[PDB]
Design a protein around this nucleic acid. Structure first.
Ligand SMILES: [Zn+2]
Lengths: 189, 169, 191, 78, 52
RNA sequence: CAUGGAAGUCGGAAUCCGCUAAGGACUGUGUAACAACUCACCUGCCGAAUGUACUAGCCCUGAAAAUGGAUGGCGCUCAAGC
């Protein structure tokens, strides 16, 4: 609980120093992804996140220095963190969005769009054919590499990805999902 | 009780499996030999009933009547598209004018007749099998007459095309 | 230690009607009628508001208070069942021997009876008789799917179980021989 | 790499636990080429790790790699 | 040959179960006490031997 | 270190820090070794009291013998039992 007690002092000190704060809607952002984006903004700006701070921060509202803090209490809803930056709005406005990962299927994820596999030459050895056998895709061997004959619709959109399908997708370096950091509404923007 | 579409899939996949071993152990010294059904290197049949067939036997038989170029029609199966549109001319992909699904040439031409003998013989429609027998002008069964049901099938298939001729060819 | 008052409530949508008399519940809506007999339970029914049913027990023990929440969900199922029906699905699973099913509607006895043939390549023919009010269907969207539907959840589920329990393997490994008819999802007809 | 004679073979078959090495401030040269790979907040903060990773040799004299970290008084940009 | 998902469903009803060490009864996958009476509702349970 | 090979998960000995909202030189499944899955830990939703370890009353399991059978018998359940 060392950080738990510290959180009040750490939050109050940092918030006052930074004139403007960005609240960011972090949904399904991997720890590695969060670590790397920190490096881009590591030089300028500070990022802090914790469990919902509505009640604890409200105590600061009572004391006279800032009554506007109450205004943002309703805005924070769920799974959204906020970031402190001393820079101007325009340069940091859209700069943080840069970087997007391409997460492989997790054998249970729901595809937003239909996933289509085009015909072509994989270039992989003949031994890997067994994986293709389960999905039933027609295959032919050309120049000692597996060649897909005709395109086959892997899965209908909105259905959970089968465990067999997920393993195949990562090998071919094709995935529907793309994930990136998301900005929630900031200071009435 | 395999359906025609399912049966076609099994033949394809097994040929692919055999192809993988031939490809992996092929000697590079001479000959890029691989098994392809379109090349007439695969035949189908049942040893116990002594009936076997290859694509050419059906192709030439259909070539004689309602057939223009047998050799061009050789690569008319195993992929690409199969045609049954209102317009005679064939097209690529199974999409039709109204969106109805299209036939599969291997099942529609080769595999439709074979099913017909099995169900009729098992259901004891001797009159029907005789009627179908004369539709393609099949030859008479000689000695085998009285015994019907699971005995005709070997006899009718042997008369329709004996395995030995296909093997030698 | 006996609790002095235990109370539960039940909301009723304004699409049906319900009448209670000597612990004989009758629910009637746009899909039929259902009855139950709760004479084995000592509960007091009453009307709290214009659209809320109430039931209570006084000076009950621990073993006796447990039964209030049971009664609530039983009556709730009747209300939801009459206005939304129920629908179970079942799937075939086999390795070598295909399973064949026949569904013929009995005439003058109303109820349906199923027929299972060729189970694990078996020569016997086994027959099961459904309960009145349940309707059996063979799916047309997916392959090898059975669909059971009806009005009373207890009958629907019990009829499905009969089909599942009739198809068993004997004197084998049930870890390897995975043949049989099984249930795959439970839900309602509407929505 | 920066150690005492190299045991080519046959003498190294048994244990070979000769970990009694010594370091003072040379290790920082080995620090530099690591190019601050992953969010270490400059050399001063990250110094704690490399010493503690080399806990096998127990530094030298009365020093212990863990002992260095808590008494954080050394130059940070050096 | 069984389709993957099928294996999962059929195994749920046949394979993932606990077993009493006193009366060999077949128990749910999250039980803590046997439900029979000749064993005394014992609470020494073990998983069903998975088939490799 | 160890050795055919042991990348957290055959074994021996150590048991540190960075970034945090959080992550163990690790709890299992798994590979010849990798990979892959999961747990510990933290977070999103909800709206109020729970969680663990012990003690002794009645009841239950532990509790298998030979002609038909004995709280004296019939019978007794907010007892006609303690
Ligand atoms: Zn037990």
């Amino acid at each position: 609980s060392g950080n738990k007690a510290g959180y009040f002092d750490k939050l109050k000190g940092l918030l006052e120093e930074y004139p403007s704060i960005f609240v960011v809607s972090v949904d399904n952002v991997s720890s590695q992804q969060m670590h790397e984006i920190r490096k881009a903004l590591r030089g300028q700006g500070v990022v802090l996140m914790g469990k919902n701070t509505m009640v604890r921060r409200a105590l600061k509202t009572f004391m006279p220095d800032h009554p506007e803090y109450e205004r943002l209490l309703p805005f924070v809803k769920g799974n959204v963190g906020f970031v402190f930056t001393n820079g101007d709005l325009k340069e940091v406005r859209e700069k943080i969005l840069s970087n997007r990962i391409k997460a492989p299927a997790r054998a249970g994820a729901i595809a937003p769009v239909d996933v289509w596999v085009p015909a072509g030459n994989t270039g992989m050895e003949p031994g890997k054919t067994s994986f293709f056998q389960a999905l039933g895709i027609p295959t032919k061997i050309a120049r000692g590499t597996i060649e897909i004959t005709t395109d086959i619709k892997l899965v209908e959109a909105g259905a959970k990805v089968g465990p067999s399908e997920a393993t195949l997708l990562n090998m071919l370096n094709i995935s529907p999902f793309t994930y990136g950091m998301g900005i929630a509404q900031v200071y009435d923007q | 009780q395999v359906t025609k579409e399912d049966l076609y899939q099994s033949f394809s996949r097994t040929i692919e499996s055999v192809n993988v071993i031939i490809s992996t152990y092929l000697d590079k010294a001479l000959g890029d030999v691989q098994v392809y059904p379109e090349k007439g290197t695969v035949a189908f049949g049942s040893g116990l009933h002594g009936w076997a067939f290859t694509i050419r036997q059906f192709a030439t038989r259909y070539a004689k009547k309602f057939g223009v170029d047998r050799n061009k029609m050789m690569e008319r199966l195993w992929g690409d598209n199969y045609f049954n549109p209102k317009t005679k001319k064939w097209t690529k992909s199974p999409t039709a004018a109204d969106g109805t699904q299209l036939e599969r040439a291997f099942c529609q031409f080769i595999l439709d007749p074979i099913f017909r003998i099995f169900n009729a013989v098992m259901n004891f429609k001797k009159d029907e099998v005789n009627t179908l027998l004369d539709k393609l002008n099949l030859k008479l069964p000689a000695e085998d007459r009285d015994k019907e049901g699971k005995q005709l099938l070997k006899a009718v298939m042997r008369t329709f095309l004996p395995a030995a001729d296909c093997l030698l060819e | 230690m006996r609790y002095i008052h235990s109370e539960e409530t039940i909301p009723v949508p304004e699409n049906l009607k319900v009448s209670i008399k000597s612990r004989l519940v009758t629910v009637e809506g746009p899909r039929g009628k259902l009855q139950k007999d709760l004479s084995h339970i000592a509960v007091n029914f009453s009307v709290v508001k214009k659209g809320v049913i109430g039931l209570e027990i006084h000076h009950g023990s621990r073993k006796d208070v447990a039964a209030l929440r049971t009664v609530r969900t039983i009556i709730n199922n009747m209300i939801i069942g009459v206005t939304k029906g129920f629908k179970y699905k079942m799937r075939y699973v086999y390795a070598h021997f295909p399973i064949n099913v026949n569904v013929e509607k009995n005439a003058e006895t109303g109820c349906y009876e199923v027929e299972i043939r060729n189970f694990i390549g078996e020569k016997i023919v086994r027959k099961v008789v459904m309960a009145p009010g349940v309707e059996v269907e063979i799916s047309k969207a997916q392959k090898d799917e059975l669909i059971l539907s009806g009005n009373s959840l207890e009958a629907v589920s019990q009829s499905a179980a009969d089909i599942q329990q009739i198809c068993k393997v004997r004197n084998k490994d049930i870890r390897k021989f995975l043949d049989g008819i099984y249930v795959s999802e439970k839900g309602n007809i509407v929505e | 790499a920066l150690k005492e004679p190299p045991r080519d073979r046959k003498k190294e078959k048994n244990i070979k636990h000769n970990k009694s090495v010594s370091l003072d401030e040379i290790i920082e040269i080995a620090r530099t080429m690591r190019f601050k790979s992953f969010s270490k907040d400059l050399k001063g903060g990250v110094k704690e790790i490399l010493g503690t990773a080399f806990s096998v040799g127990c530094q030298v004299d009365g020093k212990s790699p863990k002992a260095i970290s808590d008494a954080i008084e050394a130059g940070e940009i050096d | 040959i069984i389709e993957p998902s099928l294996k999962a469903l059929a195994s749920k009803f046949n394979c993932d179960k606990m077993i009493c060490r006193k009366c060999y009864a077949r128990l749910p996958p999250r039980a803590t006490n046997c439900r029979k009476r000749k064993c005394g509702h014992s609470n020494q349970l073990r998983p069903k031997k998975k088939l490799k």
